Design a protein around this ligand. Structure first.
Ligand SMILES: CC[C@@H](c1cccc(NC(=O)CNC(=O)OC(C)(C)C)c1)c1c(O)c2ccccc2oc1=O
Lengths: 99, 99
């Protein structure tokens, strides 16, 4: 889906089968989502946002399906205000930003 | 201009002739930058990001020159670790996400 940015780039994706609404964020290097139970193969990590740092759990090689393409990427679960799909997933989707 | 997202999309923006380095962010609605003087017709606002809330001064209708185009958009200034150009500027530039 070509994304005219007139409407916030929000989409529904499946993170290991569970559907979640995520924001396509070209400013974030990482992806972070609240509320899904991905498991016990984690590693506490810290992600620094624009307002401060939050503790998160890093999950490697997770199956993600968004915009009809399946990818495997690192997702971090934490107490985040909005769910964000960062550049690590956008690049795996082959997503670019055009002018 | 196309921007693969392999690297953070950081460009140099001239806001009222003052050069700043801004991160092109699709996820953000507003644009925030620090270290620039925009005058005295502002409105104090609060923006919520990952990690916390940010105090800002909002300036409407400012001349911005970035990616070879000139626009008039609202810019917020605040003590942010990273200058972000959000959707309000990206729509004005005519940018779109792709694939
Ligand atoms: C602009 C930052 C960015 C973000 C999101 C998710 C993870 C990370 N973290 C990274 O992947 C990059 N981290 C990084 O550059 O670290 C700092 C200390 C220099 C900021 C950053 C970011 C937003 O798009 C954003 C968009 C809408 C609302 C609040 C937001 O609130 C943010 O914070």
């Amino acid at each position: 889906p070509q994304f005219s940015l007139w409407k916030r780039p929000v989409v529904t994706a499946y993170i290991e089968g569970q559907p979640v609404e995520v924001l396509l964020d070209t400013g974030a290097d990482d992806s972070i989502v609240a509320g899904i139970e991905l498991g016990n193969n984690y590693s506490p990590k810290i992600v620094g946002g624009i307002g401060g740092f939050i503790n998160t759990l890093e999950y490697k090689n997770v199956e993600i399906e968004v915009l009809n393409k399946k990818v495997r990427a690192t997702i971090m679960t934490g107490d985040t205000p909005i769910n964000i799909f960062g550049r690590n997933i956008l690049t795996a989707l082959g997503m670019s930003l055009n002018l």
